[PDB]
Amino acid sequence: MVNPTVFFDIAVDGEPLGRVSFELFADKVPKTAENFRALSTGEKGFGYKGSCFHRIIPGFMCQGGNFTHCNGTGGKSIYGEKFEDENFILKHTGPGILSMANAGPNTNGSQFFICTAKTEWLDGKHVVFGKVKEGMNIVEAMERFGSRNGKTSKKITIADCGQLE
């Protein structure tokens, strides 16, 4: 069992900030991990490259993953539009947790968030599927471009992304 690793190269109004890498917990949440992995490589013809982190709340999380598709602008999964919550085995235990955004039960698409703190009130509500490996410093730098309501002060985008291992 060897879990895949993916990376994002982050930019601030196009100026390179740095690389964040993630372990995807395919051993626990294979369906969810695979969605994020494929969106990161762009292999289905759509994905995270060029997308923004549109909601960043200091001390809480950085949210991203929207892109244009035939039926909208807030992203979609590799399984059609939405998919079920796979399981809630893993918890939002601390900084660096990678979890799925949603609009209630069984509404996972492409949007995701990276926690910058323990967020236990999300346990059982959002599917945790990965964690930051390298580049937590870069996530902390992203956080400085957020605000209490989540609006970012500069455009925080995924300049490049893909699979490392």
- SS3 assignment for 123-140: CCCCCEEEEECCCHHHHH
Gyration radius (Cα) of the chain, Å = 14
* 122 has catalytic annotation: yes
* Closest C-alpha among 59, 160, 161 to residue 118: 59
Tokens 């609006």 locate to 151
Residue 90 among the catalytic residues: no
Contact between residue 52 and residue 12 where contact means Cβ atoms under 8 Å apart: no
Alpha-carbon distance 72 to 142, whole Å? 26
Catalytic residue status for 92? no
Is 163 labeled as catalytic in the residue annotation? no
Q: Is 60 a catalytic residue?
A: yes
Q: Which of 37, 54, 92, 126 is catalytic?
A: 126
> How would DSSP label each residue in 33-54?
HHHHHHHHHTTTS--STT-B--
Q: Which long-range contacts (CB under 8 A, 24 or more apart) does 63-72 make?
A: 63/101, 63/111, 63/112, 63/113, 63/114, 63/150, 64/111, 64/112, 64/113, 64/156, 64/158, 65/39, 65/101, 65/109, 65/110, 65/111, 65/112, 66/110, 66/111, 67/110
State the catalytic residue, choosing from 35, 63, 66, 108: 63
Resolution (A): 1.4
Beta bridge partners of 62: 56, 114
Residue 130 CA, distance from chain mean position? 9
Which residue out of 7, 25, 36, 60 is catalytically annotated? Answer: 60
Which among 8, 22, 112, 113 is annotated as catalytic?
Answer: 113
Q: What are the helix (H) ranges across the chain?
A: 30-41, 136-143
**Which of 55, 90, 108, 112 does the annotation list as catalytic?**
55
Nearest alpha-carbon partner for 117 in 135, 152, 143: 143
Return the CATH number of the domain spanning residue range 1-165: 2.40.100.10
Is 3 among the catalytic positions?
no
Confirm whether 111 is a catalytic residue.
no
* Beta sheet of 128-132, edge-to-edge order: 55-57, 61-64, 112-115, 97-100, 128-132, 15-24, 5-12, 156-163
**DSSP helix, strand, coil percent of the chain (3-state; round to 5):** 15, 35, 55
